[PDB]
């Protein structure tokens, strides 16, 4: 599923040598993207606005890299951010609207020094690439994997990155945590400290409630499971450009379904989807996935949007 | 026939769609 | 009405008076009618007629102030009095956008703004203009391309003035100095919106883009001043839904000579949306049409 | 005639006008 088969097939695949640490660079910012991107996390995008299509077409011919800011209030309030490098690109046009479909991957964190908008309209950010500290972390990484098996790796193989820095970011990308805490881990430059905060977090997180009411538990960490190699959480883009960060769990509560299942543009092929909403406030929480054949290993599952859930 | 652009939820009547769209924005 | 071309240079810094009551997002080229009754307001227009005839209409993003605005040049002026009260009626035209550097109030209460005339970046893509025009004609079908400008800058602003879009979208444009970036954004708008709804409940679709029609040269949208100075930007459509009418038609101060007006309101929240216009003679072809107030609608 | 200055809506009862104006104000 992490391959994003839904966005396209005949997509061009590109990757590039990273900027050095403590370097000061000038990078164009996608203003629409409103996520705390984590290095290593893939970002699927369907761009329709002519301005964005103009920039990304420009980006494919230079460094294939743009900046995804980290807003704490958004009213642009970003002091940090992450770079994303286009690895898959496809030009498309339907309904008289020209579409650019990209798959990018987070590569490096940076501190924002200056944001200015040019005469062409594209917004540029001068960034300082933050350093990636590492060390010996075998103990921490073992402590993490264990607690991971006691959640979803019960049936999930330990196919996880060996590098402490890479491990720190996989855990960071697949942890049911609010943004304000995700940004904390990205603000740590030392892998070892990141891994530690992750451990102290994994031991203190239990339930996920709805954010608009804060009075209804939807699921528990014990339900988390991975149907991809992305771990329990991943980003998918819908046919109108909306990116959703999807946490997959086996069972959930306090949800009312909306109508009949659909099979269109499903992010998990072979499964159908039905919108799920909170029984108390009626805010969208996600979708329930139902197998379309009996041979399916998991038969029914839930894909929730991190945007609608808050820890405990 | 009335489908939400964020989530895909389809409705028989637009009045249901509109007040569903208003939920994606807090209201 | 005395008919009457001040063009400040780019990046020039001016001190222009601000009509406070006005709470609009004026687009260069769009006409703005006004009826003034406050002694100070008449004083201001009388002073403005004697100098360069332009004032500033601030583009408030609320939280009040405002960071931008557009200059307006009075081109029609008539003074009269009723109840010994002296009223000034003017028609002004939007001419140039500006960044607000400092807003200060005079003893009279008239506000003065020190502003910077913003530049008008242009470019090419006649292909963008041809596409927009085509989409526009399908929307109205009464549009006369030969009634549309050729200058990229002018065309962008005509489109910006006659598109049924909320202020927040009207403010996003205008803030773009590049005609091309303006036109592109207009396309993204035209391609991402087909229906209009009541802002106070957003639970009622009132009309669709295919219903928009132009009854005059200013195009499908236009500003009108009611007998009390309330300015309304009216989108004329042939058909509308989810509206209740208030009472019997009236002919007093009909902005469209020949048509009677009955207030229309949302069926769900009862908020004013506009007026239904019905012919008073069998000769008129439209017979029935709707004038929706831009302030009361929002795009899907 | 209990007419509204903003839109011209006329009413038989003052209280009907009053609650109509409050739909314009605080709009
Ligand atoms: N400017 C501009 C511009 C705007 C829109 C454009 N359109 C062009 C034509 N449309 C084709 C079409 C229509 C209808 C459907 C039904 O599926 C829908 C619908 C609405 C929201 C969602 C989904 C699915 N879904 C998730 C959840 C579940 C899962 O597992 N995966 C998902 O995808 C959603 O959130 C599919 C494709 C689509 C695009 C355009 F061409 C330009
Ligand atoms: N200080 C001071 C000071 C203030 C105000 C002063 N004036 C004095 C003279 N009065 C003349 C008069 C009164 C009553 C009417 C009835 O019609 C009304 C009423 C109220 C709002 C609206 C309408 C119509 N309408 C739209 C509908 C669509 C369309 O086609 N056209 C429109 O106009 C509205 O919005 C008409 C004219 C007017 C007030 C003054 F002499 C001093
Ligand atoms: Zn809830
Ligand atoms: Zn929805
Ligand atoms: Zn309403
Ligand atoms: Zn009224």
Residue numbers in the entry:
A (entry chain D): 54 to 67, 69 to 128, 130 to 190, 249 to 425
B (entry chain E), D (entry chain B): 144 to 170
C (entry chain A): 64 to 67, 70 to 129, 132 to 190, 249 to 425
Passage from the reporting paper:
The ubiquitin E3 ligase cereblon (CRBN) is the target of therapeutic drugs thalidomide and lenalidomide and is recruited by most targeted protein degraders (PROTACs and molecular glues) in clinical development. CRBN consists of an unstructured N-terminal region and three folded domains: the Lon protease-like domain (Lon), the helical bundle (HB) which facilitates binding to the adaptor protein DDB1, and the thalidomide binding domain (TBD). We present the design of CRBNmidi, a construct that readily expresses from E. coli with high yields as soluble, stable protein without DDB1. Importantly, the stabilizing mutations introduced based on PROSS analysis proved to have beneficial effects, with the best-expressing construct (construct 8, hereafter referred to as CRBNmidi) incorporating 12 mutations.
We first determined the crystal structure of CRBNmidi in complex with mezigdomide and the second zinc-finger of neo-substrate Ikaros (IKZF1ZF2) to a resolution of 2.15 Å. Importantly, the higher resolution of our crystal structure and greater quality of the density map at the binding interface allowed us to unambiguously observe several protein-ligand and protein-protein interactions, including contacts that had not previously been identified. At the phthalimide-end, the ligand’s glutarimide moiety interacts via three canonical hydrogen bonds with His378CRBN and Trp380CRBN, while the oxoisoindoline carbonyl group forms a hydrogen bond with the side chain NH2 of Asn351CRBN. Mezigdomide adopts a characteristic U-like shape around its central phenyl ring, wrapped around Pro352 and His353 at the tip of the beta-hairpin sensor loop (residues 341–361), conformationally stabilized through several π-π stacks and hydrophobic interactions. At the other end, the piperidine-benzonitrile moiety of mezigdomide fits into a hydrophobic pocket defined on one side by Phe102, Phe150 and Ile152 from the CRBN’s Lon domain, and on the other side by the tip of the sensor loop. In contrast to the extensive contacts between mezigdomide and CRBN, no further interactions are observed between mezigdomide and IKZF1ZF2 beyond the known stacking of the neo-substrate Gly-loop on top of the isoindolinone ring, consistent with the molecular glue degrader binding exclusively to CRBN and not IKZF1 at the binary level. In addition, we observed several direct protein-protein contacts mediated by the degrader, also not all previously observed: Asn148IKZF1, via a hydrogen bond from its backbone carbonyl to the side chain NH2 of Asn351CRBN, and through side chain packing with His353CRBN; Gln149IKZF1, via a hydrogen bond from its backbone carbonyl to the side chain NH2 of Asn351CRBN, and side chain contacts with Tyr355CRBN; and Cys150IKZF1, via a hydrogen bond from the backbone carbonyl to the side chain NH of Trp400CRBN. In our structure, Cys150IKZF1 is not within hydrogen bonding distance of His397CRBN, unlike the cryo-EM structure.
